[model samples]
Every structure is written in C-alpha cells, then in structure tokens.
Target: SNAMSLLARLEQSVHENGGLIVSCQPVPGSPMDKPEIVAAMAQAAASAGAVAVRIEGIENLRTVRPHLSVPIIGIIKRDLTGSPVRITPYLQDVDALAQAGADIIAFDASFRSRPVDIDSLLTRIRLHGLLAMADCSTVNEGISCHQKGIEFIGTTLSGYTGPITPVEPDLAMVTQLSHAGCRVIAEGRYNTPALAANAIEHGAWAVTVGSAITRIEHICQWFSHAVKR
Candidate 1:
C-alpha cells in the first residue's frame, strides 16, 4: 500500500507539476554531504516546484523521503574498479532503494559493464512494484531499455561513459530517443533553466538538472571565474 500510494502520487505529480526532476546529491568531501543537508536540499527543490527529486544514495533518499510529498527517483552510486556503469548496478541496490522509499528505481541500463544483467534488474524492479528508470548514455541504449519494458530513460550518463565526454546536454540523443518511441528524460549537463526548457522543446518528457541547482560551490566557481575573466 505504501508503494501504491507513492506510485499514484508520482503519476499525479508528473502530470500536475510538469515534468521537472531535480537531481540532488552531495559533492563528496563537501560540508553538504551530511544527510540533514541533503534532505533539506531535496525539500527546497520540491518547494521550488520540482515534481520529483532524483536522489543518489539510499541514505540521502531515506532522509529526504519523509520530508517531501513528491515522488523520489532513487539511485545508488557504486564505483566499480573498472566498469563505467555505476549507478545502481545490481539487483541488491535496486531492492535496497525500493525498500528505502524510492518511488522510481533509476539504474544504469546502458550497454556497459554491470553487476548483473539489465533484464533481470528491470524484472526485479517490477517485481518490487516500483517504476523503472534507465540512465542511458546513447539513443540505442535508451531504445534497448525501453524495449525491455522500462518506463523512463535518462541521458544522465551520456558523454561520461565513453572516451570523449561531451560537456553539453545530448539534445540530439534526446530527439533520437523520443523519435524511437522512448520516453526520453533530458539530463546530463543541463545546467540552466533555458537549457532545461530547451530539452523539453527537443522532445524530452522531463528535464533533470543537477549541479546547476544543487552544487552551490560549483555555481559559485562559475561566477568567480566569470568575474575574474
């Protein structure tokens, strides 16, 4: 019943508040890494009209969940010694996230090294009665995840997975994914409201902005560099 209530609220929120998911995470080694601050950040994002908050780490998600009425798109970041796929790489991470009140399970569903198979991971998410979100780096990967019956595909890992990491949002991939009948979520390097809006213009079902909103130090650095210039 808890999951059902959360799921229904998510459907309502996405429709009611427009599709804006705020990716809030603490920059490791920052003072904001505290669970309380992370929860407060998520609360602030929700108060600022984000329909949902995409949170990394189960501890943060747990602290943030009780503080917000909106849905939570949850993930777990585990750095494998060699693999590019790190976000929620295994079935256990997905289950832990769901158990911790993740309304939607966001996992690395790209074509790369994973702790387990994508199909089995997706099935586990479904079995737990949570929505599935695939964090993909390419259009083909998005299509593949969608083909596997995943509900959402985010461009979160784009440019970070391959050799050449592009420093801009992949609007081309977003367009292609949408054209391919995938529910595209515009993420990765979307740093401004204009850019986020532009992703929606390019056929993204939702726009998720992270550092621009959550990373205060990063924002300050941008301002400092611009002023110095």
Candidate 2:
C-alpha cells in the first residue's frame, strides 16, 4: 500500500526504463492495511510510468481499480490444505484474480506443489481473458509450466526450490525458460543494478525485486539481527 510510498518515486524510476512492475498489496498478513492506500499508491505509480503493477489479490485490485490506469498483475496468497506453496494454490483463487480486472494473474506453478495440474488452470485463466504468469523456482519448472501453456513465467521462487536457483537471478534463466518456449521474469531477492541487468541479458521480459526494494520489515529484521558488539 501507500504504506511503502512507492507511488511517490514511481515515475522517477520507470519512465527512465521500459517501465516498472510495482508490487502493490501485501502478502496475506504482511502487516499492511487500508485498501485505499494501495489504490492510491497504484494511481501514483501509473502516473510515474509503470507498465503494470502486481497486486496482492482480487479484493485489493477492486479497491485499486479506479485509482490506477496501468495494467495489473494479480496474486492471491491463500493457504492451501495440502500444498507446499501458498501463492495462488487454488483454482478458486486463480479464477477470482482473473475476474478482478487483472491483466495477468500470478500463481505458483512450481513442480514442488502440485503445480503440475496446470491444464485446467490455464483454461480458467484464458477463459477469464487474463494472462497467466506462473511463479516457479527452477529452470526445469519454468520450462514445464511453459510447455503447459502459461503466458509468462517468473523465477520468483528460485531459491525456495529444493535444489535452488542461484541467488543472483541469472541470464541463463531467461534463456533456459525461452528454450522451453516461455517468457520469463526475474523476481525474488534481487537487489542492485548488476543483478537485474544480468537477468535482462539472459532474456527476462522484466524483473520484480520485492523485499530488497519495498518490504521494509525484512530490512528492519536484517539490521536488528546484526551484532553491535
């Protein structure tokens, strides 16, 4: 939400680049509130030259609609009974994200959490007229999702994969995903100019760096845990 003041510096960042993907809305209990705050924030970001903004869920998107003019990448962070991943694990959540004016709906399409049953999910996303951007950890998983017909896929969960993708979002990743026939986005713990540039060189359509850029809580924790002695 506006809790992060992302809107204030949006145009300053995106207009210079192709555009930016503003991560709006907080993860389910990520300590943010006031839907209007996000709505207002999106408006601010769109004005600044954001091609699109990724939001928390359909509910938040509804609030941000009138305030924003750019495209929205939607997500639903709900807990699934048996799924290891909680990033849009249910078909119900996927359907809702599409219904809520999301140009792109993001979901965990990793091999780790039954992300394999994408046949029906892709149908649902297309039926709702939304692009499907899957969140995957490994190069193999991204490829798998691509073969299943997702519009765009991301390396957002890269390190969380049991085998792990490199900490630095690699250029090889984009090539890897492309080789499998899919568009790739680099997301996750990426910070610094070099890492993003590397990913673009590899073939990333765009990149999304959250915790390092926006989520201040993690930042606070980092310092708080550091030793003063």
Candidate 3:
C-alpha cells in the first residue's frame, strides 16, 4: 500500500465481500507538502471505501485523523542508510505511530536488525491495544515475525530488502502463520493479478498492492517505457 491508491481497491473489496487498506506514505525528501493534501487523500479514500490508510512519518497524522473516519495503519519508514531490509525500523517508530492515533502500526520486524529488540516492540504494540502489522522479506523472516508475537504478518519486502522465494504463496505464509496463531497480510512488488491472486489463494487474509496502483513514478514509467517498446 505504500505507493498505491485505495479508492478503486476499496470499492472493489467492498463489492467483492472484502475490505481495503491503503498507504499514502511519502518517501524521504519527497514533495508531499501541507496537511491539506493528506486530509484530501484521506477524504477521497473514505469516499471510496478504504478501511484504513498507511503512511510513513507523523507529519500528517494530526490533520488526517480528525478529518478521516477509518482506521489508519501508520509507520515511519526511516531508512537506516545501507541496512538491507527495513523501511521502518525499531520500537520508537511504533511508539510514534501509536501516539499518532494509528489503529494498526506496521513496521519492519524481520531478523535483519536496525538495532532494537523485536520482542519488546511487539510487546509495546500489544500493551497499547493497537494492531501490529509486521513486514518481512523472506519466508523465514515471516516465520520469525509470527513467532515474535506480531498481530499480522506482511510480505512488503518481497523483492526489495528481502530475498525472493520460488514457492508460491496462495496463503502459504498465512496458513503457516495461522497454524502458529497469526494472520497474514500480503504486500509488495506483486504487480500482477496472477501474483496477487496467488497470494490470496495461498492464505492472505488480504493483499496490499503498491506501485501497480498509484505511484506516479511507476505509472509514468509504464507509458514512458511502452513508447520505447
């Protein structure tokens, strides 16, 4: 959801007997300015049936929460600069997201560390009664996250910071996690319907698609690349 829009998906999910979660996070030093943009985004997302919104950093949360009615899954996607697998690191980020009124705070909880105890982070999330959505890159990492007590597991790092697996996930991770007592939320780099569907078929309670939906950079790339092709 980091780079995708929720409007269409929200409508699709509701019509299809499902729900949608969207991410509106701006990367480091991006051009997102003013709380109004976030307010408008949240309003539009609400109108379209989004159950929640995910964002990095708390810059817009204050303005967004009051204007929007749905839950917001917040995270501060801070890069540790050369660290292999984290878009959001450590417990402080979770603390900030919770303080910002986020209902579900998603963060990187894989074994690849950014200098914090993952166990304590999960504990804090539980203590606050807020949902913890753990993002991992590999199946082993996903399994590790589930064992650490995260409320939900996500594959947001599938090909970016994490290793790719040949085995298809129709809910494999979700099923595995469920058996271990956890929920799975699929995400990342899954730009095709086949991949997304495969994820759901594998066991994902839900799937989150990013660049394929709304990253202006990627969308422009499609048309731009097609011209060359």
Candidate 4:
C-alpha cells in the first residue's frame, strides 16, 4: 500500500539529505539528451551525493526516473501563446510530471502573467499528491508563493525576467527570502562549488547547480578562456 504522503516524504528528504540538489538538464540536440546518457548522468550525480535531482523536461524525467533512487524535482518548460511564465505553465504539465515519477513539481511562480490558471493548477497538483515548488525571481514572489501555500521556492529566474539578467547567483535575494521566512533554495548561475556552498551559508535551505557540473561545452569554454588569459 502507498502509505507515505508526498509532502511527508519530501520533508523527510530535506531532513536526511545534507542540503544539496543538482539540476541535470540536457537540452535537445545537446550531448546528454539520449535516455541512456541522461540516465547514466543522473545515476552519477546520485552517487556523487545529490540528495535530489532536478530534471528540466518531462521526457528527461521519464528517462532518468528509473535510474535514480533519490527524490526527483521535475519541471516542464513551455512557452505558451500568451504567457510570459514558461516553466510548467499548465496543470496538465504538472499532471504529466507527476505521472513521469516526479516527487516534487516545480513551476514558475513569478509575477509575470501566465495564461494558465495558477490557483486551480496548484490545487490540482496538491490533489495529485505532489510537493509544489515555486521558481521565483524576487523576494515578493517567494513570499507570495509561500503565503499561497507553496512548499518550496527557488531563486531560479532572478535576472532572466527582465532587462537586468543576472549572470551569477543572487545570494542577497536568497538571503532576503530566507529573512522573510520562506524556504528558499538557491539556484541559477552558481558557477562554482564555492559559490554553491556560499549560498548555504547565506541561509538557503538547499542549492541547485546546473551548467557548472553538467554542461560540458560550457565547462570547456570556461577552461578555454582561462588558458587564453
């Protein structure tokens, strides 16, 4: 019998796992897109001590789910015809992610107008027995989602929302959210191990790293620049 509730298990994971979540996104046409490859990569990350793995696409989560043993944070990126919020825009996306083996469903809780119905979508996600994660761009967004009963918030779109896109992790933003009593997870542009660790010191519940550890092309380009310098 399925006795354990989704939120209970998720809370247990947060308590047991030492506060680190790794995002492993393999873009289409990128080197790690294949199911086998993505599965292998997710396994490797789990072995390397990722308490939870964040999967970007629905297909990727489906591919990586069986290979992973830890909690999975899943999201679907969809640019709708009339919505600025693209991450998991619809309730169907949440339903698909849950069916795909996502323990936690992440969506854009940003202030941007989205065509999808946010209230009903969140309610449906709760009914489907999944933990809800809100990806926020500012402190208000984080607090608002928390007040609206979202379980987790990540600083995933801090600068990507407008003209001032940040090229680094917004530690201050994370701290601000934390100060406001939100369960903030630091993400986005954390390019180094030290930077990720720094987020924890600044009061992040957990930190998620993406391209720094997974994107080989970007990693190589950084080295190339260093060598040239």
Number of the top lDDT candidate? 1
Instruction: List TM-score per model, in order.
Output: 0.93, 0.79, 0.77, 0.92
Q: Which prediction has more favorable TM-score, 1 or 3?
A: 1
RMSD, every candidate, angstroms? 1.9, 6.4, 6.0, 2.1
Candidate 4's residue-wise lDDT over 113-162, tens digit each? 78766677688778887778888898888888889878788999899898
Model 3: per-residue lDDT, tens digit, 1-229? 3212333443455457554555664333445445667567667766775566776667788778887876677877665765654554667777777888887777776666466666777787777777677877667777887776665688776655535454443345555654555567777655666877676666666666555543556667778999995
- Once all C-alphas are superposed, what RMSD does model 3 give against the true structure? 6.0
Full-model lDDT for every candidate: 0.85, 0.69, 0.65, 0.82
**Positional deviation of 124 in candidate 4, in angstroms?**
1.6
Q: Please give the lDDT score at residue 188 for candidate 2.
A: 70
List model 1 lDDT by residue over 51-104, tens digit each: 888888878888888878878899998888767678898888988998999989
Give per-residue lDDT, candidate 4, residue 52.
82
Model 1 residue pairs with clashes: none
Worst 10 residues of 4 by lDDT: 1-10
Q: Which candidate is the best by TM-score?
A: 1
Give me candidate 3's TM-score against the actual structure: 0.77
Quote the positional error of residue 140 for candidate 2 in Å.
1.4
